[PDB]
């Protein structure tokens, strides 16, 4: 039995909502797909945003909810908990492959009924087999596209799922509230008849109210058989959700209810990942405040909150088992940027963001991804705050650094007031909460692969120059990068012309004043982010060549290609050793290794910033992983850096590789502040991980605040945290049964170490475990 994250002393009713989501197995649900599906077969011919529309509210209207025991807010995409909820008019074809696999898979299982298997095989794939947006995307991509995707150059994300990764006008629909948006909208289909979109938000937003009505017809029925207590709590839902179907909010428990419904209504609309949450703190605390002014007691808010904590925790995307080995252990992406600036560029850090800090103490959960603005007017008991919860070792909060974020927004015509605002997509994408369309995940770009290409290429070439390699690879780069835009753009139409969100778009600016969706460019900021990955090994790797190769003439580069091609095996066993520990390795504070990671990267970054999306923005640069370091590894054979084939590439995005920093964490800070880390608007992701003995105390939050403001100073982007010894992570691979609770950092976001598969597993195991 287990003994991670136990809590003590918890919340009871926080503590018995938060088991409920695990008592049962993860099963498919094709509830949505079966509804999406009647709708569709009555809406051929119609606007696609329009059936769009249609099928979301089929959805609202016909989908069983329940309300689940102690639940103090309404709202669940599903009644069982964490199933997932199957797409397949993106893609029907995956799932075929693994219907007797799903259940049993490396990663990420869910069970597959048998009545289920039937009804997908019988009333769904006959339907959406060529009829779905993953057929348009296989016809449309070009043939280098395809063969830089064979020769496993880059990966396309999104082409079998809903695009998601967009964080709402939260404070716009708390506001305003749903009616509002009705009368609006009327008025806009009044004055422009001939404009699709107008109508389709009408539909969704006419669905919602009376989705708020189901769940207090609900409420109101249960309360009649339920305990004296859960009664009024019944009755005070009830009246709630019949309040919000039309009115705006008036308390904090309201503006949480509200929140989460929309949160539901836009899973039921794109079911994707990352429909992120934003600046909760800051848009949630006037109705805090609101409430202790009129006697609302802060305990009862607590549970709310902690309700809506747990509500986050339900949502789970499925995913194809290739898909799995990118992004494994559910990064849904319910984001929460806390603390940071107000307008005036003062500290925005507010007593409702204390809150949100310590409500997680009990919740120890994946969700919600909580993350710290931080700045040099960061209050310091905030600060201490942050590093005590950064010390529970579940990887939350992670860190966004105000210093790089906002001039790195202005860089791309972010206004100052939107630039103050921003808060994270997702792990890492930064971005401008309900003004952006960022497809801020859109692509995988394996910048070590390209490099091996080149030494390859050129492996025959006696005259070859060290220079000769760096053109190369930076040609490279240029063909790649141009190929990777033309499919990002592929998948950017896909998603406009088999899936508009109307419902979201009414949520971004400036998708109402213009008329468009986001799908069509309406929000005030498109971009297209894609993500530059294995840039560690890369500069270690042409270290190791330079000084191997061409100034201490040890081998050729033929010789050396041949090593590579041998896989360091046999004669060449020391000569891996050799190229591990005799060459400064990138994370050390060598000047001569990391300037090379500096000039690549921006090679790459200011080579996507030439193009242009189908919106009419721009590419723009990320340097994360997800989990995707262990299947881009093992696209690449063994380089010059001591990399046997198939071997992890370095975690995160720019985290040094496992075991390669040797001169402590401080020294980290110190390689990665070279990078010019102003060029990843889409975000970018260090992991550093702390040996837990060496934060205990006041002493460790102290020097753990001192080491935050040292990174904050030298304007890395983002850090995080693992808080776990080696002993307990092998404890855990060997007995998984008492670490059923234990969470990890794998970047960007935060796992159930026991349902990561073995190669994720020993990367987070092999990453150094730092001292303060
Ligand atoms: O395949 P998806 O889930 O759409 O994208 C992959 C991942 O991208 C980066 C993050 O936003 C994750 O939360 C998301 O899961």
Redesign the pocket.
């Known amino acids: 039995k287990n003994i991670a994250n136990l809590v003590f002393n918890g919340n009871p009713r926080i503590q018995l909502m938060k088991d409920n989501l695990f008592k049962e197995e993860r099963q498919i649900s094709l509830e949505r797909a079966l509804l999406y599906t009647e709708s569709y077969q009555q809406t051929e011919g119609e606007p696609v945003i329009i059936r769009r529309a249609k099928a979301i509210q089929h959805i609202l209207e016909n989908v069983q909810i329940s309300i689940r025991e102690g639940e103090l807010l309404a709202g669940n995409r599903t009644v069982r908990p964490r199933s997932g909820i199957l797409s397949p008019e993106m893609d029907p074809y995956w799932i075929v492959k693994e219907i007797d696999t799903i259940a049993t898979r490396p990663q990420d299982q869910f069970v597959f009924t048998e009545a289920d298997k039937k009804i997908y095989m019988e009333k769904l794939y006959p339907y959406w087999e060529g009829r779905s947006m993953k057929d348009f995307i296989n016809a449309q991509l070009t043939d280098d596209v395809q063969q830089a995707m064979t020769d496993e150059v880059f990966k396309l ?2 082409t079998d ?5 967009i964080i709402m006008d939260f404070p716009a629909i708390l506001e305003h509230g749903v009616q509002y948006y009705i009368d609006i909208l009327s008025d806009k289909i009044t004055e422009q008849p001939d404009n699709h979109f107008f109508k389709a938000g009408y539909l969704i937003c006419q669905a919602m109210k009376d989705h708020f009505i189901r769940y207090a017809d609900l409420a109101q029925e249960m309360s009649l058989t339920a305990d004296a207590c859960r009664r009024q709590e019944l009755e005070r839902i009830a009246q709630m959700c019949y309040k919000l179907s039309q009115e705006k909010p008036d308390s904090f428990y309201e503006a949480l209810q509200l929140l989460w419904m929309t949160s539901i209504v836009a899973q039921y609309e794109s079911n ?3 429909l992120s949450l934003g600046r909760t703190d800051q848009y949630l605390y006037p109705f805090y405040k609101a409430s202790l002014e009129a006697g609302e007691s802060e305990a009862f808010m607590y549970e709310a909150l902690g309700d809506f904590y747990i509500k986050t925790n339900d949502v789970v ?1 499925l ?1 194809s088992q290739s ?1 799995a080995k ?2 494994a252990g559910f ?3 319910y984001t929460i940027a806390l603390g940071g600036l107000d307008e005036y560029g003062h500290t925005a850090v507010n007593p409702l963001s204390y809150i949100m800090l310590d409500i997680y103490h009990e919740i120890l959960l994946p969700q919600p991804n909580l993350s710290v603005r931080m700045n040099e007017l960061i209050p310091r008991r905030f600060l201490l705050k942050t590093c005590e919860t950064i010390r529970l070792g579940t990887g939350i909060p992670q860190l966004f650094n105000d210093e790089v974020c906002v001039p790195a927004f202005l860089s791309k015509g972010v206004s100052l007031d939107d630039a103050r605002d921003y808060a994270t ?3 890492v ?1 930064t971005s401008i909460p309900g003004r952006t369309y960022g497809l ?2 859109i692509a995988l770009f394996n910048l070590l692969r390209i490099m091996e290409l080149s030494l390859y290429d050129l492996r025959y070439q006696t005259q070859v120059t060290y220079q000769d390699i760096w053109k190369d690879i930076e040609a490279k780069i240029d063909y790649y990068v141009n190929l990777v835009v033309k499919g990002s753009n592929i998948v950017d139409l896909g998603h406009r012309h088999y899936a508009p969100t109307p419902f979201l778009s009414l949520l971004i600016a400036d998708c109402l004043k213009n008329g468009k969706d986001v799908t069509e460019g309406g929000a005030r900021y498109n971009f297209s982010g894609v993500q530059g990955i294995g840039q560690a090994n890369l500069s270690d790797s042409m270290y190791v060549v330079q000084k191997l190769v061409f100034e201490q003439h040890e081998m050729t580069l033929a010789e050396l290609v041949d090593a590579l091609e041998a896989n360091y095996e046999g004669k060449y066993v020391n000569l891996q050793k050799h190229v591990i520990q005799d060459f400064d390795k990138y994370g050390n504070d060598n000047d001569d290794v990391d300037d090379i990671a500096v000039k690549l990267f921006r090679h790459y970054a200011k080579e996507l910033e030439k193009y242009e999306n189908v919106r009419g923005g721009r590419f723009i640069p990320g340097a ?1 992983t ?1 989990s995707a370091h262990i299947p881009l590894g093992e696209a690449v054979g063994a380089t010059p850096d001591g990399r046997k084939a198939k071997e992890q590439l370095a975690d995160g995005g720019l985290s040094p590789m496992v075991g390669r920093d040797h001169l402590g964490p401080t020294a980290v800070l110190k390689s990665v502040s070279k990078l010019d880390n102003y060029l990843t608007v889409n975000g970018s992701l260090l992991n550093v991980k702390f040996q837990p003995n060496t934060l205990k105390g006041i002493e460790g939050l102290t020097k753990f605040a001192d080491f935050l403001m040292a990174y904050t100073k030298l304007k890395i982007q983002h850090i995080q945290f693992n808080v776990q010894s080696k002993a307990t992570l092998l404890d855990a691979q060997k007995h998984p049964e008492k670490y059923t609770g234990l969470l990890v950092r794998v970047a ?2 935060s796992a159930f170490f026991v349902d990561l598969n073995k190669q994720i597993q020993d990367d987070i195991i092999a990453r150094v475990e730092h001292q303060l």
């Open positions: 994300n999104q799922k809903g695009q998601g990764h994707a990942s990352s995307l995913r898909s990118c992004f990064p849904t992406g997509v997702g792990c994408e801020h995940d994360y997800v960007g976001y």
